[PDB]
Amino acid sequence: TIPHLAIDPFSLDFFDDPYPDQQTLRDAGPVVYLDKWNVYGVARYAEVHAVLNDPTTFCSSRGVGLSDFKKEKPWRPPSLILEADPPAHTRPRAVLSKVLSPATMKTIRDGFAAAADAKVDELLQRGCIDAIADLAEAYPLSVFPDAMGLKQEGREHLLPYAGLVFNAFGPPNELRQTAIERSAPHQAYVNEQCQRPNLAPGGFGACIHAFTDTGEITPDEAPLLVRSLLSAGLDTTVNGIGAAVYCLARFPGELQRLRSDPTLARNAFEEAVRFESPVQTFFRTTTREVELGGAVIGEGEKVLMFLGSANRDPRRWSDPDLYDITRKTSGHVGFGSGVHMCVGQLVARLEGEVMLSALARKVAAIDIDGPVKRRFNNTLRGLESLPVKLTPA
Numbered sequence: 001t002i003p004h005l006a007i008d009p010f011s012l013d014f015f016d017d018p019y020p021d022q023q024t025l026r027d028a029g030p031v032v033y034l035d036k037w038n039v040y041g042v043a044r045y046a047e048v049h050a051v052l053n054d055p056t057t058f059c060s061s062r063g064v065g066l067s068d069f070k071k072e073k074p075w076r077p078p079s080l081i082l083e084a085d086p087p088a089h090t091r092p093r094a095v096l097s098k099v100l101s102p103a104t105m106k107t108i109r110d111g112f113a114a115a116a117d118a119k120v121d122e123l124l125q126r127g128c129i130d131a132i133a134d135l136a137e138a139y140p141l142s143v144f145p146d147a148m149g150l151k152q153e154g155r156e157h158l159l160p161y162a163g164l165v166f167n168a169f170g171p172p173n174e175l176r177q178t179a180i181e182r183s184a185p186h187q188a189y190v191n192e193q194c195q196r197p198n199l200a201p202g203g204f205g206a207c208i209h210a211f212t213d214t215g216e217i218t219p220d221e222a223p224l225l226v227r228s229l230l231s232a233g234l235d236t237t238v239n240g241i242g243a244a245v246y247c248l249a250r251f252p253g254e255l256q257r258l259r260s261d262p263t264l265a266r267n268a269f270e271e272a273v274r275f276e277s278p279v280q281t282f283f284r285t286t287t288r289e290v291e292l293g294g295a296v297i298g299e300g301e302k303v304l305m306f307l308g309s310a311n312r313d314p315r316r317w318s319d320p321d322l323y324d325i326t327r328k329t330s331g332h333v334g335f336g337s338g339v340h341m342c343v344g345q346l347v348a349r350l351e352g353e354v355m356l357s358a359l360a361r362k363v364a365a366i367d368i369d370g371p372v373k374r375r376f377n378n379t380l381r382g383l384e385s386l387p388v389k390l391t392p393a
């Protein structure tokens with residue numbers, strides 16, 4: 001009854017242009033079977049949202065990559081938050097929610113905004129810049145490692161480590177195997193920085209360790225929760241900000257609306273997160289036989305959720321393929337949904353808001369002016385190089 005498709009959603013041809021195949025995945029039915037990898041797939045908004053909000057049946061403790069932790073060894077010790085279900089998930093989640101809380105955002109906002117303003121002014125002096133290396137990477141690198149409290153030495157391992165993490169959620173294709181092979185130096189750097197003596201007092205890392213006093217996490221849990229922030233907290237924002245700039249470059253009408261009201265910066269970033277969905281996919285594992293979209297899925301089955309597809313499903317979104325900075329974005333799944341919804345979303349939105357605010361106030365036009373190159377990753381969608389000319393306001 002369930003349709004079987006040969007589409008490989010982790011193929012370079014799919015990454016190069018995923019939208020026709022995402023429509024095929026939605027329109028084949030509410031649930032598909034992907035013969036290439038022997039997993040179920042759900043690509044429509046309703047089912048993706050339902051699965052995310054059904055954690056007792058669609059669990060995370062057997063891994064949110066293709067690999068099932070009940071069957072294979074995890075490539076690194078499992079995340080205490082991402083790869084945990086309630087109740088084990090609950091207190092580690094509360095610790096990160098407090099470390100990255102509304103109140104915490106007050107302590108970093110002025111510096112994060114100042115760094116964005118200065119970066120945009122610097123790029124305007126250069127005029128022709130690469131919006132990936134010179135902006136989407138440079139700006140988060142200038143704020144987030146410091147906000148973590150990381151030392152200077154070794155920071156060149158952060159983005160390679162994150163590329164590995166996100167590649168490793170994928171199937172054992174060439175991207176994943178090349179990522180994991182000889183990755184020990186990246187792992188050793190990150191694991192060392194998670195130990196309490198290496199984290200500057202006052203930064204996110206030290207604050208995680210300070211929560212061991214409360215009973216919410218033990219001392220031996222704190223390094224793995226620092227590791228969570230060093231895994232998810234940088235490369236995501238690189239692709240989120242990159243997506244926003246690419247959107248503004250492609251939709252000059254929307255850049256002009258943002259210039260006219262820079263208070264749209266935060267929703268312009270949220271719409272970029274829906275529109276591009278920098279985190280494209282991840283998995284759940286069934287804990288029991290379950291009916292979904294009229295299909296009966298057995299226990300212990302991997303289910304691939306297409307977040308980017310759900311964020312463009314015309315069943316849910318009007319003009320889903322348009323970038324609209326005044327869209328009512330609430331309900332998009334680019335940050336997830338339910339108990340695992342991105343605990344770093346206020347940090348992500350802060351960075352995106354203040355960069356888009358700096359662009360809105362300082363830049364009059366953004367023109368692609370060189371070869372654009374895509375960056376391939378089993379989980380992340382974004383660009384390797386985005387040459388643009390920035391004209392000052």
Ligand code: HEM
Nearest residue numbers: 081082232233236237240334335336340342343344347348
């Ligand atoms: C635009 C930027 C970002 C995007 C699109 C994004 C996306 C996501 C998504 C889709 C999930 C859900 C995972 C699941 O349900 O299995 C998630 C969870 C998570 N994210 Fe974000 N993220 C971003 C930025 C960040 C940042 C800046 C941080 C930390 C400073 C962070 C830390 C985390 C953590 C620790 C989790 C696991 C939460 C849990 O399992 O309860 N992320 N993220």
Ligand SMILES: CC(C)Cc1ccc(C(=O)O)cc1
Nearest residue numbers: 079082227228231232279282
């Ligand atoms: C979209 C998510 C898969 C991003 C992510 C990655 C890693 C972690 C961790 O806890 O290590 C948490 C969240």
Ligand SMILES: [Cl-]
Nearest residue numbers: 076187190191
């Ligand atoms: Cl590691």
